[PDB]
């Protein structure tokens, strides 16, 4: 059992630098490249007393790549795997897909082929990017389309950072997100999502960090993506694999948008005063403001829900906790899936980074759940897109790259097809 990953954009490599430092300290891998069947999923055996991750950080702009080469984690990652481009995507879906995308996929696509040939138990793929930019939108759809036609049957665990409702980093991110989702709607099996102001709200209230940064945001994100793959690494009472995320969460092949959340988030001084059990954290993850997306779950209905625990959590009190969620009428489940619960447990507990913002806890939980609540966000993104599309704003840059007005209409109607599917399935 093994799995490979590729990181795209500033959002990907910043999570890439933050997640692989977490994976190395879990398995006792020192940052100099060296220290049985626990690290074989992500890390390889480089002859004798040396390891290499199964990672390929790709990015067109070279500032992030050489910083990793001149960073602290020099000897861990392969120097050849750290791919760098020549010219930035420049916040454009077309530029990272046709001009700069086509001339760099050929080094990239053949690399993941031979990097998979040395492996034998490749379960699937997981990517890291953000559709708010150019390289995260154009190049990501290109490679994911280029490998889906080759492999197809293997899974694809997308991790995209969508823009917030009112907070935003760019101005043309509806154009970047609406075009790349036209290709991602059919090829991606599942895609977990993260938001900007929502994750700031997590560390503001519970973790009381009044001045956080992206370095702190990626740590708890690393706890999420490391905890979902913690079942295949360490032994568990109920082992789950990456293929469970396709069967239990995707009721229809074109409705493949779960939410993401994590608990318990608690500081050092607050950890010793707050009680740690499954009952209080089971209510915390279902709390609406404790999610990683500004979206009201009370408005919609949960299509499916998955739970994955860590640490010394016995199966008694965890089953009594979810039974209290069923009779709690604050949230409402859809009639099309009454038994929409997938429980998981791993024995290895949540770790802690030296000097990190999160505290050590003897147990944790991460919930991924499909719901019809995210239709209003697509309505919001589609609504604001019509305001700029009516004035033809920021269009001359895309057609200057090689595109036209036609596929903008395809990107509009394809999201319009998604809304009528979300209101139909939500009946």
């Amino acid at each position: 059992r093994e799995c490979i990953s590729v990181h795209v954009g500033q959002a990907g490599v910043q999570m890439g630098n933050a997640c692989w430092e977490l994976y190395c300290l879990e398995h006792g891998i020192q940052p100099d490249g060296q220290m049985d069947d626990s690290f074989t999923t992500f890390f390889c055996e480089t002859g004798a007393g040396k390891h290499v991750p199964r990672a390929v950080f790709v990015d067109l702009e070279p500032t992030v790549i050489d910083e990793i080469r001149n960073g602290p984690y020099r000897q861990l990652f392969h120097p050849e795997q750290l791919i760098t481009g020549k010219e930035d995507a420049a916040n454009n879906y077309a530029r990272g897909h046709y001009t700069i995308g086509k001339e760099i996929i050929d080094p990239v696509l053949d690399r993941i082929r031979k990097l998979s040939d040395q492996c034998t138990g490749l379960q699937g793929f997981l990517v890291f990017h953000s559709f708010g930019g150019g390289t995260g939108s154009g190049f990501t759809s290109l490679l994911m389309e280029r490998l889906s036609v080759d492999y197809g049957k293997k899974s694809k665990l997308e991790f995209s950072i969508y823009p917030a409702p009112q907070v935003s980093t760019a101005v043309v991110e509806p154009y970047n997100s609406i075009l790349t989702t036209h290709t991602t709607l059919e090829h991606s099996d599942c895609a977990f999502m993260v938001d900007n102001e929502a994750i700031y709200d997590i560390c503001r209230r519970n973790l009381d960090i009044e001045r956080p940064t992206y370095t702190n945001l990626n740590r708890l994100i690393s706890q999420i993506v490391s905890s979902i793959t913690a079942s295949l690494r360490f032994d568990g009472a109920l082992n789950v694999d990456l293929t469970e995320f396709q069967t239990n969460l995707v009721p229809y092949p074109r409705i493949h948008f779960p939410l993401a959340t994590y608990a318990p988030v608690i500081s050092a001084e607050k950890a010793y005063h707050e009680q740690l059990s499954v009952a209080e954290i089971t209510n915390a993850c279902f709390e609406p403001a404790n999610q990683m997306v500004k979206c009201d779950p009370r408005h919609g209905k949960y299509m499916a829900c998955c739970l994955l625990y860590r640490g010394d959590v016995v199966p008694k009190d965890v089953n009594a906790a979810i039974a209290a969620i069923k009779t709690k009428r604050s949230i409402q489940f859809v009639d099309w899936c009454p038994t929409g619960f997938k429980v998981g447990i791993n024995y290895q507990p949540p770790t802690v980074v030296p000097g990190g913002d999160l505290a050590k806890v003897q147990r944790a939980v991460c919930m991924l759940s499909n719901t019809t609540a995210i239709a209003e966000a697509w309505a919001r993104l589609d609504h604001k897109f019509d305001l700029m599309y009516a004035k033809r704003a920021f269009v001359h840059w895309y057609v200057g790259e090689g595109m036209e007005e036609g596929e903008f209409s395809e990107a509009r109607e394809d999201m319009a097809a998604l809304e009528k599917d979300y209101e139909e399935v939500g009946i």
């Binding site: 500033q10 940064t213 920021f394």
Partner: protein, 426 residues
């Protein structure tokens, strides 16, 4: 990796260009002789983005100084950082233009433009992969507007795909040190509106207005004015000169700020702008900086933004800071002032930050704004041109070089068009 070819045209362009290499040399820690004496290793990470490597660990700048008056080069060469430039790049004529756009564009420029194209071709092919062109000129005069705008046309013909960036100072009616400003102004914007992808509209009176209120210099010279505008030149190209948590290249700034091919005339700004007698009484936290960035009186253009609506704005921060306080300041600044922002765009702000601030300051940022208030400058410039053109005043000197009066009318046709273009989106 993504080299930028610098080209200093005109008298003022050589001054701010000379100050531009001065202020960034302290950031990279380069001696005036050309050797490195810095402290950080990241200064050498992206020293090639502006400089070229040479023997003895010497770094010559990729600057091309062009001017039709040899006395200007003697002052730049005899400056503090005058010896670091390449002697071969100092190409220049002998006879000045005398504040005539026709002389520096048709006759006096045409004899020298064959000499400068072979020089910039050397710096272009010598690099690994060129990104764009960072030019400095003035819309007034003949050598800045005539010859500086000419090579913009030739570089567009040779390199139509690269970015054409211009830091251009422009005249105003309150402060006017030249009689032929509106004729030179209206002829220059005809070329800048069609060829260049991005331009920064800097008004000279606002350089004096900002130094009274915030900086309160009692004896300001032109060198003090060059310092604050050259900081903006360092802010726009900070993301590729040093690493950052959210890098924005010059092309990444273009797509967010240039919603239409003609509407690319920006309005720069910079902060912190505080005197020495009031530095201790100010907090370097970002909310005190954000209110100064979007302030109506902080920018280096005299157009008041409250009389119009912002089309799109960008703020490139510098220094280690918290992103939540940075991002949330962009929320309340636009929603509380929704009248001064267009409703047909959901988010007008573009964010960017770097981990390496300027030397001597821990927190700083640069304000970049494309607003519809800039048409007020095009209004007064157009009325000054139409007031002098309607009786053919000061045109017989231009006809001596073979220039036709229809080109002045064609420049006048472009003036009201771009004025009406900004009025469409307000």
């Amino acid at each position: 990796m993504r080299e930028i070819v610098h080209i200093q045209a005109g008298q003022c362009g050589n001054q701010i260009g000379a100050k531009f290499w001065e202020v960034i040399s302290d950031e990279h820690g380069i001696d005036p002789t050309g050797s490195y004496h810095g402290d950080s290793d990241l200064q050498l990470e992206r020293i090639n983005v502006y400089y070229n490597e040479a023997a003895g660990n010497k770094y010559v700048p990729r600057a091309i100084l062009v001017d039709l008056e040899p006395g200007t080069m003697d002052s730049v060469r005899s400056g503090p950082f005058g010896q670091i430039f390449r002697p071969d790049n100092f190409v220049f004529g002998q006879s000045g233009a005398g504040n005539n756009w026709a002389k520096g564009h048709y006759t006096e420029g045409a004899e020298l433009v064959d000499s400068v194209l072979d020089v910039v071709r050397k710096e272009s092919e010598s690099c690994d992969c060129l990104q764009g062109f960072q030019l400095t000129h003035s819309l007034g005069g003949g050598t800045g507007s005539g010859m500086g705008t000419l090579l913009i046309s030739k570089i567009r013909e040779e390199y139509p795909d690269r970015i054409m960036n211009t830091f251009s100072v422009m005249p105003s009616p309150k402060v006017s040190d030249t009689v032929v400003e509106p004729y030179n102004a209206t002829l220059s914007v005809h070329q800048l509106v069609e060829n260049t992808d991005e331009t920064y509209s800097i008004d000279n009176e606002a350089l004096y207005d900002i130094c009274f209120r915030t900086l309160k210099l009692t004896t300001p010279t032109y060198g003090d004015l060059n310092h604050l505008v050259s900081a903006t030149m360092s802010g726009v190209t900070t993301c590729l000169r040093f690493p950052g948590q959210l890098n924005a290249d010059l092309r990444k700034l273009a797509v967010n700020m240039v919603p239409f091919p003609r509407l690319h005339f920006f309005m720069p700004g910079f902060a912190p702008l505080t005197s020495r007698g009031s530095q201790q009484y100010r907090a370097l936290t970002v909310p005190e900086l954000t209110q100064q960035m979007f302030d109506s009186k902080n920018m280096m253009a005299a157009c008041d933004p409250r009389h119009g609506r912002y089309l799109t704005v960008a703020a490139i921060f510098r220094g280690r800071m918290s992103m939540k306080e940075v991002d949330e300041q962009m929320l309340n600044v636009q929603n509380k002032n929704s009248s001064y922002f267009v409703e047909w765009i959901p988010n007008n702000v573009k964010t960017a930050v770097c981990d390496i601030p300027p030397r001597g300051l821990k927190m700083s940022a640069t304000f970049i704004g494309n607003s519809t208030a800039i048409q007020e400058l095009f209004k007064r410039i157009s009325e000054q041109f139409t007031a002098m053109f309607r009786r053919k005043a000061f045109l017989h000197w231009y006809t001596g070089e073979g220039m036709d009066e229809m080109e002045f009318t064609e420049a006048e046709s472009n003036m009201n068009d771009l004025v009406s273009e900004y009025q469409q989106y307000q």
